[PDB]
């Protein structure tokens, strides 16, 4: 808060409350290539940069806010892999 320790009429913040993008801090964790896993927060994806850039997930959603570390974001649902494999075996024997 030290940028706001004592102030007069503060500059205009973005008007409504907006939530951040879903899971946005995973975009700012560091990854450990030899262990194959995330390890620690490296980029601050709660930082807003003094700006109001925003993304609409759907006409149905409220707008999300974009943290200043991100150059582009988008919500286009895709199915990059889909695999269904199934096999059946049936045997019937009758002896008289």
């Amino acid at each position: 808060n030290s940028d706001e320790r004592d102030c007069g009429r503060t500059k205009a913040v973005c008007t409504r409350k907006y939530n951040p993008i879903p899971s946005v801090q995973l975009m700012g964790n560091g990854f450990h290539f030899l262990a194959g896993e995330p390890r620690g927060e490296v980029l601050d994806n709660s930082f807003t940069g003094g700006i109001c850039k925003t993304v609409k997930s759907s006409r149905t959603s409220n707008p999300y806010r974009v943290p200043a570390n991100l150059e582009n974001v988008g919500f286009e649902v895709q199915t990059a892999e889909d695999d269904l494999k199934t096999d059946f075996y049936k045997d019937l024997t009758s002896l008289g």
Binding site: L34, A35, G36, E37, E81, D83, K85, D87
Partner: protein, 261 residues
């Protein structure tokens, strides 16, 4: 700190790269935690470390994975070192992939010339300054004076102390008459020595891309002479021979003896 973190990343990689694991069964990628290997499984393989297969696992018995670097081979005739990896961890079997990425590395053989005295602090932007603001002059000395015509200052400070002194000097054509030192007084003034450079020598003038001149000497003493010349078979402009006049000769330098060679 950046550079040290590069160096550390390399040492960390050499120490903890998953290549040194025994190969993970059923095509799993090895991963290494600093203490143990764990197998990242292919889709359709399961168990603790990829041991067992789904009933749909056709392309069973297919294999292939890369292995650890051989420690640097000593330098070649272009002072480059190299290391290689054999792709034998295991080698590709029954139609499995080729190993990805380069199998050899080539690196210059640079080494440390000067004595270690601990790392300096360097910060990305700071080095920039070519020319900069004046310091306060709070020492109350004298800044570097303006030397006289054809002048020079034998040793250069920013600012000289109170009572300090400076020797002027004459460019190669000339010699000092009068007292060739100035001295800093208690207020920033300089006690300018009564001095003037007197000519004794002269120098080959600037000339065009065809010589138009014969360069007999480095310096010419006053009362000697220099000659404009044509390489072959013509005459154009300027005196054939000229002698020096306490000033320079008033030589032809806008154009010289640019003859039809």
């Amino acid at each position: 700190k950046r550079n040290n973190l590069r160096k550390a990343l390399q040492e960390y990689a050499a120490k903890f790269d998953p290549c040194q694991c025994a190969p993970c069964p059923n095509n799993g990628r090895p991963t290494l935690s600093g203490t143990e290997c764990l197998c990242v499984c292919q889709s359709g393989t399961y168990g603790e470390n990829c041991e067992k297969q789904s009933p749909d696992y056709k392309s069973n018995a297919v294999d292939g994975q890369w292995g650890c670097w051989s420690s640097w081979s000593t330098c070649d005739a272009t002072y480059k070192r190299s290391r290689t990896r054999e792709c034998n961890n295991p080698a590709p079997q029954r139609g499995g992939k080729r190993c990805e990425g380069e199998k050899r590395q080539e690196e210059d053989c640079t080494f440390s010339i000067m004595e270690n005295n601990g790392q300096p602090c360097i910060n990305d932007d700071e080095e920039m300054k070519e020319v900069d603001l004046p310091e306060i002059e709070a020492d109350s000395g004298c800044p570097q004076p303006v030397p006289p015509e054809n002048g020079f200052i034998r040793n250069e400070k920013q600012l000289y102390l109170v009572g300090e002194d400076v020797e002027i000097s004459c460019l190669t054509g000339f010699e000092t008459v009068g007292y060739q030192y100035f001295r800093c007084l208690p207020d920033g003034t300089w006690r300018q020595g009564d001095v003037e450079c007197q000519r004794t020598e002269c120098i080959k003038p600037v000339v065009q891309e065809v010589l138009t001149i014969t360069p007999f000497q480095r310096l010419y003493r006053i009362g000697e002479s220099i000659e404009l010349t044509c390489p072959k078979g013509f005459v154009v402009a300027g005196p054939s021979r000229y002698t020096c006049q306490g000033n320079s000769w008033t030589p032809p330098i806008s154009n010289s003896l640019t003859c039809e060679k």
